[PDB]
Write a protein that binds this DNA or RNA. Structure first.
Length: 53
DNA sequence: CCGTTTCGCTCAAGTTAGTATATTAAAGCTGAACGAGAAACGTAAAATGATATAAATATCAATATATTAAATTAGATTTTGCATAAAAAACAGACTACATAATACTGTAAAACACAACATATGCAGTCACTATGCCGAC
């Protein structure tokens, strides 16, 4: 039902580095926000990179 | 015959009189689309009606006499309806043997990300020009 960090970024237009994407998570730059499974984050299929300011 | 006024009528805004239901549950009605077998029809071919005349063949009464198909039995027998029961095969009721998954437990690489000092393009911060009629002023 959810999508892994890589499976979500791979679908993006400008696939950034893993670290950078992980940073948009701690900075709540992604809404709807992703949930932490065990060691990886599983975002939503409709989750988008909300760039504000 | 004619006009004028009262009266029968209907429109418009108040003043009263009367009666009281919603969901379940299960049908029932009817316009419209769907899917074969048997007999009346019809053109074509085969059998028959049409048609007549001297000669050939059948029409039939009344009774004697040899002949024969065949229903009428009458006894013989395959045929037909119905189980009984055991030989023979199917198949749960047991069980160890065998190969196979879910699980028990040790061994090892590596995914996934916080944490931390830099590095720096890029968006944001701050000011002037691009581009063209307002407003204000005359006509």
């Amino acid at each position: 039902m959810y999508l892994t960090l890589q499976e979500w970024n791979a679908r993006q237009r400008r696939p950034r580095s893993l670290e950078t994407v992980r940073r948009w998570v701690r900075e709540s730059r992604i809404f709807p926000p992703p949930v932490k499974d065990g060691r990886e984050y599983l975002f939503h299929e409709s989750a988008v990179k909300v760039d504000l300011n």
